[PDB]
Design a protein around this ligand. Structure first.
Ligand SMILES: *Cc1ccc(-n2ccnc2-c2ccccc2)cc1O
Ligand SMILES: *Cc1ccc(-n2ccnc2-c2ccccc2)cc1O
Ligand SMILES: *Cc1ccc(-n2ccnc2-c2ccccc2)cc1O
Ligand SMILES: *Cc1ccc(-n2ccnc2-c2ccccc2)cc1O
Ligand SMILES: *Cc1ccc(-n2ccnc2-c2ccccc2)cc1O
Ligand SMILES: *Cc1ccc(-n2ccnc2-c2ccccc2)cc1O
Ligand SMILES: [Mg+2]
Ligand SMILES: [Mg+2]
Lengths: 7, 228, 228, 7
């Protein structure tokens, strides 16, 4: 999976 | 549910729930705070987003486990339980979308709040699209696209290319193109253009702002590496 | 809540919830299975225990965070929220204790099931004791002690010293002595005697049974290292 | 904290 925004 | 608690108390309890990793509580406290009817500060918008992102993130992870088992199996229990989890996830997304529509977005006039909420709207439609299979899957996808697009248009007019919300919006819209809209070339182009225009603006920033922007640029780079 | 679902379906859904790390669901499914009124198999007892241990374990971790903040702070929000979490935890423990009392324990006649349930009873009273501060804290502690003690007496009469449930019971009773009953010397003695008597029985075991027993013996050793 | 039983 690709990275969506996360802290 | 939270009508009898003070707004400030709801906010303080949301912060405490975050510290305790009680994200369902924290979402409920922040939903109560929104329903007080006042606009949200920058910090409060972040609390709202963190709470629901963590709640739906656990639901999405459980849905993917169960969907994986269900595809491998192809009694009714696996389908039935995947449907239950799916219905719960849709209910959380509908709740967030309802908060945005009543009435966060219409009262958000500054670029920072309006882009923040519209990115939220694109995200929760994207999570709905991830599980959609029926008559309205196309409309759900277009609703995500339309929210992201309005947010993009505002962020390009009003924000520098290094602004963290502009970067993370473009990151998530690029994931939308790749994973949802079956447009990997658009996804790659957007991540590349976003990264390069931010890189050219880094010289304007303080040390702390530089750290904020380069962190999200790394995520764009990670996706580009994965996709190419 | 689960009266209209088949027992076998509840069990299958509990397994699926475990795979999805949906432990609140898994506890609810296993509570429904218990309320069907049939005795539980070895596998089913483990599913029941895993579900509630994970639920209450998250509650205990959140309670400790909030209690730590509350002691540092010494508005009412921190106390109020610690109390809410505390009430939720007590409700989960009371629910498990109610299942044991109606009617798992009274129908459990074999050593493996009776020791399993009585260890459960000692554990959930121990979790109640961890948050108890009022008139009944002593009675709660004695209820934990009494359950553990009966389980110990049965396990010494009926089980070899390497039996995993006998080992993990003694482990948890030793934690009870150390953390709850303010009896660290009893805790240390019990962990030492449990370890040494298991070590002398390891020669009787298969490869797989040896692995099961030595795993829990390591936990006894870890505690001894921490306590001495 | 000490270790109670865990998987
Ligand atoms: C196996 C199964 C059957 C039905 C449901 N379900 C659908 C809508 N509500 C529910 C429900 C959930 C929990 C308790 C009672 C009903 C879910 C499911 O997993
Ligand atoms: C969706 C989202 C959320 C948060 C950020 N972000 C990263 C670093 N700082 C920030 C931020 C703080 C307050 C308000 C807006 C953004 C980025 C992003 O894309
Ligand atoms: C369009 C595109 C695709 C991929 C990259 N990329 C992938 C992995 N590493 C890189 C890279 C690393 C260091 C410097 C430049 C590119 C880059 C790119 O522009
Ligand atoms: C700040 C605060 C006040 C009151 C409660 N509380 C006590 C008993 N029930 C509740 C409640 C929880 C959620 C929604 C409505 C009421 C908890 C709390 O954190
Ligand atoms: C409380 C508890 C639970 C589980 C075990 N354990 C470890 C390895 N095998 C087992 C077991 C499996 C089925 C039934 C009983 C025990 C040990 C323990 O103390
Ligand atoms: C009574 C008692 C206390 C502590 C130990 N112990 C602590 C840490 N290591 C050991 C040990 C290691 C290897 C061999 C024997 C003991 C042991 C013990 O019996
Ligand atoms: Mg306004
Ligand atoms: Mg019987």
């Amino acid at each position: 999976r690709p990275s969506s925004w996360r802290q | 549910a939270m009508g009898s608690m003070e707004r400030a108390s709801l906010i303080q309890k949301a912060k405490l729930a975050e510290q305790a990793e009680r994200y369902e509580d924290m979402a409920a406290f922040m939903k109560g705070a929104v329903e007080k009817g006042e606009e949200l500060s920058c910090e409060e918008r972040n609390l709202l987003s963190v709470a629901y992102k963590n709640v739906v993130g656990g639901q999405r992870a459980a849905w993917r486990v169960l969907s994986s088992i269900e595809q491998k199996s192809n009694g009714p229990e696996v389908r039935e339980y995947r449907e239950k989890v799916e219905t719960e996830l849709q209910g959380v997304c509908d709740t967030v979308l309802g908060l945005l529509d009543s009435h966060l977005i219409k009262e958000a006039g500054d670029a920072e709040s309006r882009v923040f909420y519209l990115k939220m709207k694109g995200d929760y439609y994207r999570y709905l699209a991830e599980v959609a299979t029926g008559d309205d899957k196309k409309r759900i996808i277009d609703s995500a696209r339309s929210a992201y697009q309005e947010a993009m248009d505002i962020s390009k007019k009003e924000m520098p290319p290094t602004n963290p919300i502009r970067l993370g919006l473009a990151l998530n819209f690029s994931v939308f193109h790749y994973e949802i809209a079956n447009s990997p070339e658009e996804a790659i182009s957007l991540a590349k253009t976003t990264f390069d225009e931010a890189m050219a603006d880094l010289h304007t920033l303080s040390e702390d702002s530089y750290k904020d922007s380069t962190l999200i640029m790394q995520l764009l780079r990670d996706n580009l590496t994965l996709w190419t």
